[PDB]
Tab-separated table of C-alpha atoms in Angstrom:
chain	number	residue	atom	x	y	z
A	137	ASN	CA	-33.663	7.038	32.435
A	138	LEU	CA	-31.488	9.650	30.715
A	139	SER	CA	-34.221	12.278	31.028
A	140	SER	CA	-34.430	11.537	34.749
A	141	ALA	CA	-30.636	11.753	34.997
A	142	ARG	CA	-30.670	15.127	33.240
A	143	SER	CA	-33.412	16.282	35.607
A	144	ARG	CA	-31.354	15.255	38.635
A	145	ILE	CA	-28.665	17.795	37.663
A	146	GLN	CA	-30.529	20.415	35.593
A	147	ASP	CA	-34.006	21.389	36.776
A	148	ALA	CA	-34.788	23.380	39.904
A	149	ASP	CA	-36.206	22.012	43.148
A	150	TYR	CA	-39.030	24.546	43.207
A	151	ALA	CA	-39.605	24.106	46.938
A	152	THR	CA	-36.012	25.096	47.701
A	153	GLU	CA	-35.974	27.869	45.089
A	154	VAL	CA	-39.206	29.393	46.407
A	155	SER	CA	-37.814	29.207	49.941
A	156	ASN	CA	-34.631	30.963	48.806
A	157	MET	CA	-36.620	33.623	46.940
A	158	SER	CA	-38.746	34.362	50.005
A	159	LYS	CA	-35.661	34.444	52.222
A	160	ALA	CA	-33.897	36.802	49.816
A	161	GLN	CA	-36.928	39.098	49.812
A	162	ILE	CA	-36.866	39.142	53.620
A	163	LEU	CA	-33.160	39.986	53.556
A	164	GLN	CA	-33.818	42.726	50.991
A	165	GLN	CA	-36.499	44.453	53.049
A	166	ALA	CA	-34.482	44.059	56.251
A	167	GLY	CA	-31.381	45.397	54.508
A	168	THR	CA	-33.095	48.464	53.110
A	169	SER	CA	-34.675	49.159	56.511
A	170	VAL	CA	-31.390	48.807	58.398
A	171	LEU	CA	-29.687	50.948	55.752
A	172	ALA	CA	-32.352	53.619	56.230
A	173	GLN	CA	-31.677	53.607	59.974
A	174	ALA	CA	-27.954	53.660	59.148
A	175	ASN	CA	-28.368	56.870	57.151
A	176	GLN	CA	-29.619	58.796	60.200
A	177	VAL	CA	-26.610	57.744	62.298
A	178	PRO	CA	-24.774	61.011	61.429
A	179	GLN	CA	-27.949	63.027	62.087
A	180	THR	CA	-27.244	62.685	65.809
A	181	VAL	CA	-24.065	64.639	65.062
A	182	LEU	CA	-26.216	67.342	63.476
A	183	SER	CA	-27.722	68.187	66.862
A	184	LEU	CA	-24.877	69.866	68.743
A	185	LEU	CA	-23.448	72.890	66.949
B	118	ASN	CA	-55.455	-34.489	10.125
B	119	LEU	CA	-53.182	-31.930	8.451
B	120	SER	CA	-55.896	-29.274	8.677
B	121	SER	CA	-56.105	-30.120	12.375
B	122	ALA	CA	-52.334	-29.718	12.704
B	123	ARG	CA	-52.544	-26.371	10.922
B	124	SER	CA	-55.289	-25.377	13.356
B	125	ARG	CA	-53.115	-26.257	16.352
B	126	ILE	CA	-50.075	-24.440	15.002
B	127	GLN	CA	-51.687	-21.416	13.312
B	128	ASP	CA	-55.251	-20.785	14.488
B	129	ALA	CA	-55.980	-18.780	17.636
B	130	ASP	CA	-58.196	-20.038	20.477
B	131	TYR	CA	-60.508	-17.067	20.932
B	132	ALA	CA	-60.993	-17.565	24.684
B	133	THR	CA	-57.354	-16.738	25.441
B	134	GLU	CA	-57.038	-13.645	23.264
B	135	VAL	CA	-60.492	-12.405	24.269
B	136	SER	CA	-59.306	-12.535	27.877
B	137	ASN	CA	-56.136	-10.766	26.728
B	138	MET	CA	-58.276	-8.136	24.993
B	139	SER	CA	-60.238	-7.484	28.175
B	140	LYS	CA	-57.038	-7.276	30.219
B	141	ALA	CA	-55.477	-4.927	27.663
B	142	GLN	CA	-58.538	-2.662	27.626
B	143	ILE	CA	-58.628	-2.419	31.419
B	144	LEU	CA	-54.879	-1.758	31.397
B	145	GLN	CA	-55.395	0.944	28.761
B	146	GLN	CA	-58.024	2.761	30.809
B	147	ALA	CA	-55.997	2.435	34.014
B	148	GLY	CA	-52.864	3.688	32.271
B	149	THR	CA	-54.677	6.681	30.812
B	150	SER	CA	-56.050	7.573	34.244
B	151	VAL	CA	-52.678	7.127	35.959
B	152	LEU	CA	-51.002	9.247	33.291
B	153	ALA	CA	-53.673	11.856	33.963
B	154	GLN	CA	-52.897	11.993	37.692
B	155	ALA	CA	-49.179	12.080	36.899
B	156	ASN	CA	-49.923	15.125	34.747
B	157	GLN	CA	-51.433	17.014	37.696
B	158	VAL	CA	-48.635	15.829	40.003
B	159	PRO	CA	-46.654	19.051	39.280
B	160	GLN	CA	-49.735	21.242	39.884
B	161	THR	CA	-48.922	21.047	43.600
B	162	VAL	CA	-45.947	23.271	42.768
B	163	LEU	CA	-48.487	25.977	41.941
B	164	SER	CA	-49.572	26.131	45.575
B	165	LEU	CA	-46.510	27.864	47.015
B	166	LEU	CA	-45.437	30.979	45.118
């Protein structure tokens, strides 16, 4: 019973953790892509001179 | 008569404990198998990664 009680507050719900890991990977790739497109925002300025 | 009384109080009627032996053996095999399946219960975690 005490081992189960320790588990209830200690170990990881691997379904939820895997879901969070996949979600965080999606956010990482989306963030680096949107940051890449953010870096060329001032390039439009470097057209008129 | 006293040997009879000692038989009633001390000796074991083999039918009962033979039945108990059979029940215990079947319980042993069933418990080993159930423990086995409990051991592969967490293998389902190694399906999502």
